[PDB]
Design a protein around this ligand. Structure first.
Ligand SMILES: *[C@@H]1O[C@H](CO)[C@@H](O[C@@H]2O[C@H](CO)[C@@H](O[C@@H]3O[C@H](CO[C@H]4O[C@H](CO)[C@@H](O)[C@H](O[C@H]5O[C@H](CO)[C@@H](O)[C@H](O)[C@@H]5O[C@H]5O[C@H](CO)[C@@H](O)[C@H](O)[C@@H]5O)[C@@H]4O)[C@@H](O)[C@H](O[C@H]4O[C@H](CO)[C@@H](O)[C@H](O)[C@@H]4O[C@H]4O[C@H](CO)[C@@H](O)[C@H](O)[C@@H]4O)[C@@H]3O)[C@H](O)[C@H]2NC(C)=O)[C@H](O)[C@H]1NC(C)=O
Ligand SMILES: Cc1cc(COc2n[nH]c3c2CCN(C(=O)c2ccc(S(N)(=O)=O)c(F)c2F)CC3)c(C(C)(C)C)cc1Cl
Ligand SMILES: [Ca+2]
Ligand SMILES: [Ca+2]
Ligand SMILES: [Cl-]
Ligand SMILES: [K+]
Ligand code: NA
Ligand SMILES: [Zn+2]
Length: 805
């Protein structure tokens, strides 16, 4: 119930919410149907429109007008935004020369530069170039401020997940807004774009920026704008709040535009109808900037111009139907469109079987335009699994397509020509970032970065301590003139043991054999020196990784590689080696095919054994340092140490062997040497974080050898590829992956073919940031470089995406 008989007189766009059944005058009142009877009349004035004209200059104030051109409007704070231009011979902001803002130039009483977040829905990254002739205000912000060529959204590349990620710094799996439509089985409640459940606070997790600010004594404007409030009124409202007394005035504000997304859905990302929405958004930006200039705030406020996601060409004809794959289509509920999520229609149907649904959707038609996954098998870079609102069965839809349950859903719901929601590495899904103001840099281009990083920066801009989030605080310091955050490297928790030769060969009963009993003071000292670390500078280029949790591990040195060997997990946590451009690839000799050698530095009790692999009919083994890349036939023996062995399904060995035998050398030849760090990952609870031992669900049969869920590699070289990886004086270049350790290659529809036709495609899909691997291993890389720590943080957030320009 709402008693709508009170009044908004003096209360229009009041900042604090009053509680039912009292009548409201804030932004949300319309969305709850709770506004006072006179809200429209008093608070949504339109008379005479949004612009001063010459005849209005110096007019007698008429309070009915939407905005004012009377002499008293500046002190009231309610001039039309072009007042000074029309009536006082001032220039529009866009027509002024760019001039560096070296310090905040603010009115007296301003404690800090305000922040205005100007969010545009569906604003694809390439609009900045492609729409540049029609967006002069935006283009000035971009060229004079700090900009990225694009900003990476989160998956799914839909509005609510991305706006809430911008507000929180969290992945959707952690903030809980995992789609624009959701079912929460604990709640037994559904969230939709239409209707009321979406207003319930239980959907919205984490701590959004307005809460962070309010808790730390920094006031905030509303972020949500009711759809019926026109853009011109949202801008004037912001500008009126900026005229409040010091003790009442917010320091952080948001504007949202539903354009150009609304038109993009109708017309496609580049429809000729798109030029006008872009012009209209630019005009709105000009209204704000002229408005700020009238308030003497245009060299005071930090403005962020940001999108939520891009827009792709998608039409009704490019729809795949589950009814063409599944016999049982009426026993499922599909969340459809540019992604799929499947669950049982009834929890009382015990004949529902996810395994049979996955198989019925796997590589069934030659050009099939979606791929099914159990959510734990999705690329880890998506961070799209650890939430009960994400269904176990996921469908990754190809760009330009939709998935639906039955054809009738598509014609009983062509209209649309654009959509979005696809994998967040797809070029059409990328969006925009510009920062302009005293705290941002001047005329500066920065590399592309992820939207999860922005919360920390916005906190930095407001002097706030960010709530715990998925940004890497400091990785965006290069965007900022001041207010940088200067973190320390985390402390190493476990220090390594450095074992020498402590065991005789006969103490081992591992069931392993090797043909290695074949015999010099020149080369006896030389191999002692290699086992004590004499080539370590070559193979460990960035210091040893720090172990950030309590465990027991050993550093093992070898001619060709160095490793950190876990006594708990019976394998390396990491294996580091450098391959020069000149390196030669060799074979595993016939006589060494099945060779596994005990490591006399490590106890039998802390070693794997070959018998377990014999007895486990599903599990085989590989090696982390590849025997193919040995520096000499004698060094090759090191690669067959039991301490270099890891458990591998035969299907995965196809992948791994191709990576090690062909791709590593390819990379070294393309990048002028590479340093490779490889290792296992255990994430059985799909939380993105390193498992403890008691979380492992699978061991090599009859042993305590845990089976990884993934294998990673970090492949580092010199950004200036004229210098070799091992003698690089400047910035680094990295690519990484987190490959799923699967017992089949069902993910790869062409896996019956030679590995040259499918393995690299798989590896590209599972590209990763170093930071992703850090979370999954509890390791901290790049501890000893010549580079600044903020630069290294940026490097650790880099994602190699494999998309063209
Ligand atoms: C991305 O950044 C985020 C933020 O830093 C990282 O997420 C954090 O990771 C921590 C580890 O997973 C996690 O810490 C746990 O928190 C429990 C308390 O949680 C509540 O309070 C916090 C603080 O205010 C709040 O934020 C939480 O919000 C979550 O839950 C509500 C729903 O209730 C949602 O609205 C909200 O969206 C959010 O959901 C997300 O997180 C939860 C997990 O908290 C997931 O289940 C959801 O799917 C969703 O992702 C909560 O309201 C605390 O109780 C935990 O402590 C247990 O574990 C420790 C191990 O140290 C153990 O020693 C303790 O004994 C304890 O165990 C007991 O509980 C077990 C489970 O019931 C039980 O099995 C045992 O036997 C014991 O009884 C733990 O500290 C932290 O909450 C989240 N925060 C957020 C916001 O998500 C994230 O990891 C980053 N991602 C990557 C890839 O780096
Ligand atoms: C800067 C900022 C602003 C906001 C305010 O955002 C909104 N204010 N007003 C509307 C919104 C977005 C959703 N609405 C839509 O019209 C809509 C459009 C497209 C698609 S689609 N089809 O493009 O996915 C959808 F789904 C939609 F719902 C309703 C209008 C937020 C929060 C978190 C408060 C939302 C966080 C931040 Cl950092
Ligand atoms: Ca959107
Ligand atoms: Ca885990
Ligand atoms: Cl969705
Ligand atoms: K086996
Ligand atoms: Na296959
Ligand atoms: Zn949209």
């Amino acid at each position: 119930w709402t008693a709508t008989s009170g009044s908004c007189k003096g209360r229009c766009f009041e900042l604090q919410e009053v509680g039912p059944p009292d009548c409201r005058c804030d932004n949300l009142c319309k969305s709850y149907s709770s506004c006072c009877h006179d809200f429209d009349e008093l608070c949504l004035k339109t008379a005479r429109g949004w612009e001063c004209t010459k005849d209005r200059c110096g007019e007698v104030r008429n309070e009915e007008n939407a905005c004012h051109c009377s002499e008293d409007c500046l002190s009231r704070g309610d001039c039309c935004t072009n007042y000074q231009v029309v009536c006082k011979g001032e220039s529009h902001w866009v027509d002024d020369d760019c001039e560096e803002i070296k310090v905040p130039e603010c009115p007296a009483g301003f404690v800090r530069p305000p922040l205005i977040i100007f969010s545009v829905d569906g604003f694809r990254a390439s609009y900045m170039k492609k729409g540049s002739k029609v967006m002069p205000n935006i283009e000035k912000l971009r060229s004079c401020g700090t900009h990225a060529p694009y900003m990476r959204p989160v998956y799914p590349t839909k509005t609510f997940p991305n706006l809430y990620t911008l507000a929180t710094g969290l992945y959707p799996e952690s903030h809980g807004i995992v789609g624009n439509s959701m079912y929460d089985p604990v709640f037994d409640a559904s969230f939709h774009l239409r209707g009321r459940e979406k207003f319930n606070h239980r959907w919205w997790g984490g701590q959004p920026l307005w809460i962070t600010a309010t808790k730390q004594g920094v006031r905030a404007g509303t972020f949500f704008w009711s759809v019926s409030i026109p853009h011109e009124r949202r801008i004037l409202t912001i500008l009126q709040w900026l005229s409040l007394p010091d003790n009442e005035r917010p320091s952080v504000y948001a504007f949202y535009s539903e354009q150009p997304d609304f038109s993009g859905h109708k017309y496609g990302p580049f429809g000729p109808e798109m030029t006008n929405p872009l012009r209209e958004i630019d005009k709105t930006v000009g209204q704000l900037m002229d408005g700020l200039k009238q308030l003497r705030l245009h060299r005071c406020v930090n403005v962020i111009f940001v999108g939520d996601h891009g827009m792709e060409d998608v039409t009704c004809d490019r729809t795949e139907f589950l009814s063409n794959y599944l016999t049982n289509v009426d026993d499922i509920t599909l969340v459809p469109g540019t992604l799929g999520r499947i669950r049982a229609k009834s929890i009382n149907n015990s004949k529902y079987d996810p395994k049979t649904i996955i198989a019925a959707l796997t590589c069934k038609k030659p050009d099939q335009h979606f791929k099914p996954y159990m959510k734990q098998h999705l690329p880890k870079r998506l961070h799209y699994a650890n939430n009960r609102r994400i269904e176990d069965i996921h469908l990754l839809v190809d760009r330009r397509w939709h998935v639906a349950r039955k054809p009738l859903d598509v014609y009983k719901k062509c209209f649309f020509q654009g959509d979005h929601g696809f994998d967040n590495k797809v070029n059409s899904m990328q969006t925009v970032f510009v920062g302009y103001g005293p705290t941002f840099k001047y005329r500066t281009k920065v590399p592309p970065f992820e939207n999860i990083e922005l919360y920390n920066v916005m906190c930095d801009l407001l002097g706030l301590k960010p709530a715990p989030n998925n940004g890497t605080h400091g990785s965006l310091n290069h965007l900022l003139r001041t207010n940088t955050f200067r973190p320390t490297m985390p402390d190493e928790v476990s220090r390594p043991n450095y074992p020498g030769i402590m065991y005789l060969q006969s103490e081992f009963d591992l069931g392993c054999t090797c043909d290695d009993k074949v015999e010099n003071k020149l080369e006896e000292l030389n191999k002692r020196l290699h086992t004590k670390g004499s080539t370590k500078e070559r193979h460990l280029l960035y210091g040893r990784p720090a172990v950030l949790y309590r465990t027991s591990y050993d550093i093992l040195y070898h001619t060709d590689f160095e490793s950190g060997y876990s006594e708990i997990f019976l394998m390396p946590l990491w294996t580091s080696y450098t391959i020069s451009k000149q390196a030669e690839v060799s074979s595993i000799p016939e006589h060494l095919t099945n060779c596994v050698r005990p490591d006399v530095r490590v106890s039998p009790g802390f070693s794997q054994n070959c018998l377990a692999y014999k007895n486990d009919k599903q599990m085989s083994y590989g090696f982390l340092f590849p025997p193919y890349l040995s520096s000499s036939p004698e060094a090759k023996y090191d690669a067959f140490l039991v301490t270099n062995m890891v458990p591998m399904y035969p299907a995965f060995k196809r992948v791994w062997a191709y990576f090690q035998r062909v791709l590593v050398k390819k990379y070294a030849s393309e990048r002028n040497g590479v340093n490779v760090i490889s290792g296992p990952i255990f994430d059985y609870n799909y939380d993105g974080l390193r498992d403890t031992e008691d979380e492992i669900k699978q061991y090599v049969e009859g042993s305590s050898i845990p089976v990884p869920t993934h294998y990673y590699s970090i492949i580092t070289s010199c950004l200036d590829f004229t210098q070799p990886a091992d003698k690089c004086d400047g910035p680094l270049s990295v690519s990484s992956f987190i490959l799923p350790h699967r017992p089949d290659n069902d993910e790869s529809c062409n896996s019956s073919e030679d590995e040259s036709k499918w393995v690299e495609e798989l590896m590209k899909m599972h590209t990763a940031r170093v930071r992703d691997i850090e979370h999954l291993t509890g390791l901290d890389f790049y501890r000893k470089t010549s580079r600044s720590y903020s630069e290294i943080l940026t490097l650790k957030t880099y994602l190699h995406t494999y998309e063209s320009e």
